[model samples]
Target chain A: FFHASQRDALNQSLAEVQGQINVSFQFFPPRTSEMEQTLWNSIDRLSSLKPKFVSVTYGANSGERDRTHSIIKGIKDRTGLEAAPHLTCIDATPDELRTIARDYWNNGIRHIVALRGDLEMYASDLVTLLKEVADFDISVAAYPEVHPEAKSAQADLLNLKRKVDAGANRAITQFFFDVESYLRFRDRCVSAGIDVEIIPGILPVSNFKQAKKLADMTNVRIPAWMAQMFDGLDDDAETRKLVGANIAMDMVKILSREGVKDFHFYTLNRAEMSYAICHTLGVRP
Target chain B: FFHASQRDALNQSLAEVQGQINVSFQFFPPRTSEMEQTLWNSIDRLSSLKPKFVSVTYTHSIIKGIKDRTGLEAAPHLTCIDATPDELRTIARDYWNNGIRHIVALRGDLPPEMYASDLVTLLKEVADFDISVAAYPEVHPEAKSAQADLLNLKRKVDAGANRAITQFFFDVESYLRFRDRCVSAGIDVEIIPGILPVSNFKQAKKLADMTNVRIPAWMAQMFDGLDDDAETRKLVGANIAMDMVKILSREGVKDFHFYTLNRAEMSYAICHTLGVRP
Candidate 1:
């Protein structure tokens, strides 16, 4: 029966971050020819968003594990877009990891999303290993909320610093929901003197309930006030989407204003918000 | 390296159900904006698959009232009760005038004097409406026995209803048995098994209790603890239903009716599995 906040806040917020920031997108490898078609069509549009690079994850997205190659190679060949492939060690044989690193190195792929679990082999080990194959610019995972499994913010930053020290070039955070959680974590990052660039991971929640479940798995806090903001939206989807866009805009605007330039977006394999988000976050022509 | 059912005949069997037999998807009225978007997406993606027509259970003040608005070949479910005969006639006239030729005929909380078979007879006279009535696979709660349910279904088919879409069931044997009973009773109308991809556990149990749709323990176990997880439920449920339809189609069942509860993804996946690709 009531409402607050504006979705159009993204535009105004964008005007503030205008000509200031850039983005990269994440794609999960498709399984079937149908999914292959779906992923490619979406890429055709998202590549037009002019990301710094697009990366496809390596995992059970297809048990065949044949897609990270296609997505990485396909995006590179079809568009003049720079592409990255995520690598993981979970459930992987040592030979498979070697073969993957071997293939990407040979394919002129230069970017990698490296991690211990959420991604690949432990970050530094991945960096140490990938560099041995060929010198790719390896990006490691960072936790603004301190990786849920991290013992302490002190211990976590020190651990991430180890990866950066061991040839990791950049950092993509676990997407944190509330603005304060991110801002405070950024404060902690600078205090630790870890100088490598840490890009904020932003997720615009399309479904609040799903977002809550995602938050549960990721260990991000859903603040009482934030949940209160979306409380009565169970009956209203557009408003929920609007609020979703506005909050994401609000977070990115603050980050860019404070001199953050690059963002890694977990686009949820959804196009509508990603297009709007990238364009609004000042996607360069 | 070798196969039993020749791949050529496998393709042909699929093709027979493919373009030949008709399908009609059942959609419920949306109570929320999100649900409304889902219904629209489901309709837009599914319409090209060309169901005989998509039947929606939401009644409008008049039949033309909804068709022109949604621009769908929407057959409105019309119930026969709670008004004078003149009121019902006005509703039916508006329906026919609106160019809708199909009806899911039913009685509105009335029994004995008025039944779906009675509405089938009534609508056929006023308009050249092709009615699709409901059938219970196990038996309706009100029926005395499975035999009586078959007799009632036969009565509607005899009274000019062209098809009967059953209540959703998990037990395929119950559906097969029900069809056996119907054929034995000389009911000639098509009995389309209602494919409700079991997405919600609580709702599934409630449906099982009320409509005689048996919840097989295996299906129930697959759904256990999924009551709080919609995405996982949808994914797991769709795969289970895909297996169900694959088994059903191989049994030479030509027609399938999906009860899409405002979610487009599950039924669309089942259609893909059935090789009725869009």
Candidate 2:
């Protein structure tokens, strides 16, 4: 709901994000040998743009957990960029979590993307535990669309405040298609006195069907007009890619116009779409 | 049903039908000035290929249009619907006097009591006009059996139909089989395959289901997941019709009739691949 003056202000300050925006990428731990190569190559390509820090996802299983640790270290050693592991309280006991924290700190890993995950213990509890275990810079998940399991939007906002009050250094939101969802939630955060950077999660949707499925499950509204743009393009992958990139670049431009500087991309472990967006944003090597 | 040995024979003689195949396009009368432009431009673009004739739906205006614009023989698609013997005879005589020699005679939509065979006979009485009648590869939805459908086609030919264009079909095997039955029944008229190269599979399916035509399972697989992609769908559609033409060409089919849906690109693409060119 921008007034004429506000729109004029936005129009006057277009391209202000050029050379001033900071971007970070999120990647999940790779599974197969082929996927390992794919993930490494993606990281190698995006590393050139110098993201703030890349985080690897943690799974409950031993193999995925091991991959997560190795991948974090591999990213750090290979690119000399700070790499953080997604640490969660759901899978590990208190003692085991403390041991994991100590091991990460000992190995020169200073940041942890703490999460309550889909667990009985909330993310607020995980944040408090991580701060007690080590003085690591912590990032936690926020849902501007409101978490699916939360009782209400106000309840969800209170939960995020609890996470910040406990010790989350910053809150990265769920990948949202609507910029106003993030803006409205950010205003709520400010009024609630949850003082931390609320980074907007940008997802460059190249596979629209896959995005639609995820959005449907999460109760996210993918605008009907956006769906119409991807219509009749099922067989043409190249055209879908171009259409996808155009949509994402447009979203980033609108968000940038509204003075959002830090964007956290849920890169989905692929680099081209995210890389293309960063290039357009003037984030050069 | 072509066998393995026959397939090898086809593969060796590919593109031999270039300039040997005869084609005709069917267009609807335009209702708007913009559509008049679209229809004429399509006719102009496709006219360079030198088709055997082009037919206009229920409009002698378009018959004159085709003649004046491209010097191509224009046939009027005449339906015996809500018209008495005198009205039909008047139109037939008027058309014959206007130098229109060819007509696509049909039993048009709805609860019509009149048949195409009756219309063909009437056209013959009006003048010595070259007459075309409709045949169904998949038995006509109203027919009680395949034999009944065959008898209906034989009657049209017996009443002086020069040719019969089968309804648009995807099952080439069924069309070939129906053509064989026509020969055995001693109909003896050229059974032209009516080709409808589908760019919009969803709408094609709706029409097919409405008419009781069986679109093959393989075609569904080809068009699946392509609802939002018109460009790729058109390319795939062209490839499909081209393959059908190649198959039908080897089966000794010399003529093809396209239901052009008032657009020429799909039909033109298929015709170009079959070597039907200026």
Candidate 3:
């Protein structure tokens, strides 16, 4: 089932690509001073790579929105990198979201990752509201394996298309491990006429047990083989980091060969593994 | 819990040691002439490492071929799976008549009170055969409990088995702990570590799933994207197998039994790394 020449080329996938990969980092708002310092430290370590942009994750409450706003502002000030703040429709009213969007634009943060959060069928409406508030560059979420709560794959694709139709500039997917799932989703998006840059989000797994728990929560399938790799490494963090980085690198290489240019990393506030992966892919400053 | 200096030392472990290690190879009988050719070719190539002995999975005209070709002791596996007691006695008698003293007597069935211990008892009755019984470090899939598995192994050793070869495992600490348990149970036979050098990770994974062998998550990460790339998989496989050997060697393990899958390249590379040269 393999051509020798094709196999040889794929083995050297990383070496074959140079200076064409674009990457972005995803971070969450810190809940405490020490955590904020850790986040900024991770930012500092990763800033050298000159990511396309960085995103601060949002919680539905106004408390977290303020933290996201402050972090986004701090990132722009300290590193001169454009930052996107995720805005959701869960806890805030439509009018409040518009005001939040307007304030972000006025503060020189022009990007927003609009989300519906727990609000049913509001992502498209949220995107429409954001566009009306200002000429903002908005990103919406896509699910390669289909959203866990969606009625069907078609319904999820339709929802994604509705968001894209309502001025979402690009779609950054929920972090996924299966390369084929992302590739298949891209193909389906093409067939569905949802024409936007569908960015693949990668989560480098340094702690497998933690990753597995998150995967379960999100309804993501952890391949049986992947589970086996971290079998007896519950107590070993050092080797886990090496294994995590290796997995991320391999995923990026395979995705890169399949013509995927942009990667969004869920950094989990850890920069070393993600930085090493980007460096390996020739995403250098 | 990792010391940087210790990590650095372990990373260079293979380069630090030379010789002073012993190893054996395991093979299976081929169902076809083409496969027999492949098996013999592997046997011939690995003969250079001077393995302590080679054990074939089942059947023994193949044993004679291995012994006659390389002068290596070829242990034929005798399992009590489907054969009757009289049939087993006849087969053991024939094996003794043919001068095959080494028998890997196994309880191939999930059992009928006819266990490896009974098979060992039968073989000892046939002659003073150098017998090896199977041991499961992580406990066998059908084993009721860890203690029960250990007790079964004890019975086999008590029934006159010479040594025990464990089922393949990835967690070195589990195997080490199992060895400790064996000693505590007063079973003193040499417990040889069974190493399966994974050349085809996909196939290895399938076998592992069926056999309830838990492959480490890091191993899956290593072989993740290598589904189509067999050449690269082989390189990765050799490195993994070699590193495992280094860790087990550091723990003072001298004898290793490689489940070679009737292929010589990966196993031979591991042997060379162990400093067992021609």
Candidate 4:
């Protein structure tokens, strides 16, 4: 029975996670009232873990942006949790980014997740612009597999290094199923003189229909073993989520042994799978 | 620590309470994007318990909460006390067309000049409805006197009000006194005490000012410095509500209406503590 594989993942996890590890969570703004229900429940449930920081993602749609603002303020006001707002160089001019950063600062937000959108600038250039814009603790994106647009894995590492050199404080990776890829990237970052905390991003895929579309666009490699597990899971949603939780819990167990201390969970707002993973890591209320 | 008598009272109370007590929840229409999250979260958490009826300002998700998930009915509170009877008729038709059946008819913040006594004559003419009216144990602060508040309640009953849900109060004697007065006044209707589990002291205080429901001095002491600690305040609020409901249940009270502020765990805990289950 795989030893209740998911339930069994916690024996050494409490010490490995509590003392040595830290974790943060990520959520996107929800649109409808029903979705808002799941959003708060997820945030409320995760308050038990006492994550270092929680972040809301940046989106291109104006509605998405407004929703992000509402949710960021909601999380800040309603819960005893520190919230970080994600900002991107997407469609904004440097001035717009500066104004948003200034507004965030004036509003009591100290941390930002600085991201690159379609209008790609040098990562450091954005970080520099953000510095001149507002004093913020910035976290940048890293690629365990080199960004598909990067010249090579080496070039991507340098890009991350440049951002860190320009005052970026942390790096959160894009999702990758292969744990070894992140380990190799961690080694590569250390070799390339980029020593900031590189927190591995864990994406526990929930909706099969939505995920296939996401994977089609991003480097979310669907491993064969995972594919086999979720093969007929479309109809049996309860079983589907159970397998997803098992897969994620198994990954955290492996990551802890390798001295990886913190994780950034991509919660997708339907947060049960990721929340369960945190509990399996011995994070509780 | 569990009070020895309290445990015994719980088991003893269970025998007396079941088949008599039920509950309803009140949630306002969310104004900010923030409250929508709390609204649905509250619904999801408490809908599992399948409240006697969940009331709301909107005919939408609250209806969805009951109709779509829990096999129960939703009470849509309608306050048209200031509007023209014609307009109220229009509202009445809209609600019936929208599949809403029960209505909590109230004056909503309209003053003494327009206050109770001509209860639901307009609403009843417009639709065959099970109308619930508001009651004030502390004597509607706006009333000329306690005598008038009871007469106003009786007028509503004579006009065929189905039930009366009170403004929330902490003092047991005040509610019992009001209940006795209603009985002596020949008013026959189920009077459900509105139990507000105080989550935000500031907000609750504001509503208290509006409703004229007095907060006992000791309650203010219990919640004195909870300004910054909403999490602790929430647990405090739930415990107070739980205690009130238990006392009310043992006092032969059957139904309670909770002002949930779109927070579900607030009511879920009290409901479970009083042996109301999922």
Candidate 5:
């Protein structure tokens, strides 16, 4: 998601790109008293965009679930926009989950981006518990490259299927630099009869070193060819951004031609690349 | 640890006992093909044990820098024996990369006749890895006395050891007595008492001999004359082990490690009596 500090810059850029594309803002729930002010101010400024929907991210650790829910409720109350809250089956008990579902239903909230949250220390019980409990329309995390913790590629796909069976409505993948990985993953999922939408998470490589570190940590395979494109462009930020936007736009076009529609951008708190790429995809304001 | 069809049967019995006692099993490296087969079969059967920590063991090999068996699924044992600083760093990095984080560090027995000084260099290098170590309360076999062993243990802790599993002993008095001695000596490592339930008295006595543990006269007498009666011997073994464990529990020893010589019933009975049902 683009940071709040980028609001004015993104708003100005949105006007120029308006006829070419629409946008959705993603925000983290405010945890402290000070951040609450900053978050509301940012939301107030971004409300002028008339974006499709705003998604509030779920915290990796269970620490942020309540805050995320509260912020989404605030978004619905204070703004005239659709709100999609991320839900995860981590450290949550069946009754606790049902309560959240009931609360959302009562609050007139729908459209959950479900996920299987990251593993926590001393909490393998959460995984075991999730295996048994089934109720929500969840969306699970996927990796085009194999998950580092998985026993094998086949095992990872089976794990994805298990999450789907437990009630994941879709799968949002971790970003990958290579298009072939996404295409292969799609084919495999289709062969396995996964009927849900597989939304590709795209991140334009604005910062090479930061992107490389993220790719390593998330097990996203970064192609040697893509690395070559930005190998000597460390000092040229503008050139790198243009190259990244073109690469990501090309990827979306290729995937769209292959029958994929939904795309989730890893905006990295900036709007220039996302706006440019979406505009290229003909996503109109 | 060697395995066989008999070992498989033993593992099944152990799994059943594990279900009863709510404890787990740990295995050492099996050197023979038969032992490997038995190990897998044993593992498959003991999968029912649902152990808290099923550790795979390692030892000091003569071949330089070859620590673990290298290609096994079980948690590998790391020992402070003849290890070089570089070797230990490489071992830690390798294990972390392979997704095997749990470690059981021990002041490995001197090969035939090696000294503690031979291990200090290697023990210092283990700081690079996240690992648990061994603690001795009733004294290591080669120690001049229990006090000397406690001092040796304190040194291991000072060198960055995480937790310590105690050497197997029959008397709770030794372990309980060692706890205070360890605390006084500034060895604040986890000293989990190791318990070995003898399904076979003859083999148990042999192991005790190899480790230089003096089998008390009462323990020897408990199994006397039951040699020919296998079922009765098993019952007597359970009774003797349980009695010691109960005394330990009374002394506030909550964590117990069972050396499951690939058999399950005696440990199972002891666990059942202690109200450790799964």
Candidate 6:
């Protein structure tokens, strides 16, 4: 999932499960010197999992463009896992993007999580540049729950298609709690002839307040039942973690049972819940 | 006073002022290529004016340390506007690290129009820099009353603004009355009166709206009918500003800040009338 610290324990826990399960990990670029150490240590440990692939997020508003590149390069250089760098068309100029693509190519990076990133604080020219740049296995971002900033779901899909046409290989959705929304999004993609992999991103909630805030900020509607489940359990950390693990595992299992093979986890830099969920889904070391 | 394209005319006008009237220019950090061009051009032109010192503003958050370093020098205009305490401290640390010694500290313009009550308490920790706070002579528009506004000003001085710059007012009496009120309140700080040379009445009105400064009826009436007459408007504008400054000088108010509107001629003429020659 998101946290690298929980990886070792999660890996150990996952060893008790059944069949072969390919997993992917996501990370944000480290901000401080200590964080850099934590990130590398986590990467070194997680690399043993021999994950199918590892991805690094392009931060909102293209805030950490250089950091995203550096981390992706580090993964490629230091780990055996295929490094998939997330590229967003939010703040980069066409020339700047061409240079980035060229640099990636030189570094032997093949996979890209191409996205029409959030236009939060970008200049007008940079926004236009991202819209025009081409030549990458770009995977545009999707939202199972309607994207908060998108005008409409249909409009979002059309925008996603445009990004794909510009060269995105797949679509990785923003996380959601409901299986129905994910299914609906998949159906919409199929109908639109978007044959690219529509990987559903999952979040194993550790803290209710934090999860609720994340959902609110992303404009994802949290199910009433989910809120009710976590109610009155604010101080109970162990119980909340267990509940979060079970809920996420239940969603993954449901999807796997429905013949969905690929999944992305928002690990939140903690591995226990994701590892637990992976174990429940028959994923083993 | 801000736009770059009008700087040349401003420079020419400032050169003609009566006495050495010190000026300060405020600028925002450039965020785009075009803005960068405009900023550099403005800096080159305004730097020639030999202002007291130019001031660049820090953005809301504390994130852009590198960008801030690239854009601003030793003296930056720091604010507590939308910054968290941690962010402010980090900014101070960065500022010190960059060898910046002077700061025009302010409580900053309120974010999106809401006034913060604990302005003094919020800025209590930022005592290392030379802080300046905003003052409004004719009362801040958002205040419940004029008395409340003065009370707020006193609180800012107590908090630690070594100086206060009044919002631009047209009438000299408004400023003199404000100064008297400050003295009565025991506001023992350098209270600098901001002067807006009426270069463009429309532009002044726009600024007054955001700053909550009142537009005097007489000043408004002088510019009221001259909307279509460009030459006559400039002549009348200069005369009106000179009259205002003369009144202030008569009252022994020497430190006049011409809100240069980045145009030099009218401010220079007003300075001339007050016997302020460069």
Return the top candidate by lDDT. Answer: 3
TM-score of chain B of each: 0.87, 0.94, 0.93, 0.89, 0.74, 0.71
The C-alpha TM-scores of every prediction are 0.47, 0.49, 0.50, 0.48, 0.43, 0.45
lDDT of 5 at A285: 43
* Per-model DockQ: 0.00, 0.00, 0.01, 0.01, 0.01, 0.01
lDDT values for all models? 0.73, 0.83, 0.86, 0.79, 0.63, 0.64
TM-score of chain A of each: 0.86, 0.92, 0.95, 0.91, 0.74, 0.82
Binned by DockQ into CAPRI classes (incorrect, acceptable, medium, high), candidate 1 is: incorrect
Docking class of 5: incorrect
Instruction: List ranges where model 4 is wrong by over 4 Å.
Output: A1-16, A61-63, A118-122, B1-278
lDDT tens readout by residue for model 3, A1-285: 124334444545566476888889999988778988889899999999989999998877555577788889999999999899998987778888888998999999999999987424389999999999999999999999888889999999999999999999989998888888889999999999988989999999998998899788787878877888788999999988888887888888888878888999999887888988898788876
Q: List candidate 5 segments past 4 Å from native.
A: A1-25, A30-53, A120-137, A232-236, B1-278
**Chain B TM-score, structure 2:** 0.94
- Comparing candidate 5 with candidate 6, which one achieves the higher lDDT? 6
* lDDT (Cα, tens digit) per residue for candidate 2, span A1-285: 335666576545644556888899999987688888889899999999999999898865443577789899999999999899998787778788889898999999989988866535778888888889888899999998777886444456767878888888889988877665678678657755678989988888888898999887885757656788889888888988999998888788878877788888888899999998998678878
Any runs in candidate 2 off by more than 4 Å, and if so which?
Answer: A1-14, A60-63, B1-278
**Model 4, residue A137: C-alpha shift (Å):** 1.0
C-alpha lDDT (0 to 100) for residue A216 of candidate 4: 58
Q: Which CAPRI tier for candidate 4? A: incorrect
Q: For residues A1-285, could you state the per-residue lDDT of candidate 5 as single tens digits? A: 334544455445444443433456567776677777777876765555566667788865666687888889898899968777876656665577656666775677765666556663212232233334434344467876767776444446656666666566767788876675688678667655577777787887788888898777876655555777889999999888878887787687666556565777665434556666666655644
Give lDDT tens digits, candidate 2, residues B90-143: 988999898899999998877626799999998998889899999998989989
Query: Of 4 and 6, which scores higher on lDDT?
Result: 4
What is candidate 2's local distance difference test score? Answer: 0.83
**Residue A265 of model 1: what lDDT?**
83
In model 5 chain A, which range of ten residues has the least summed lDDT? A120-129
**Tens digit of per-residue lDDT, candidate 1, span B24-87:** 6788777888887777777778876766677878455333434565555778888876655667
| Tens digit per residue, CA lDDT, model 4, B1-278 | 22543444454555446545688888888888898788877887887776788888535555655566666678777776567767777877887776677787877675583444353777777778888898889988878999988899888878868899998898888998899889999989978998888889988888887878888898889999989998989888888887788777866787888888788877888887666776
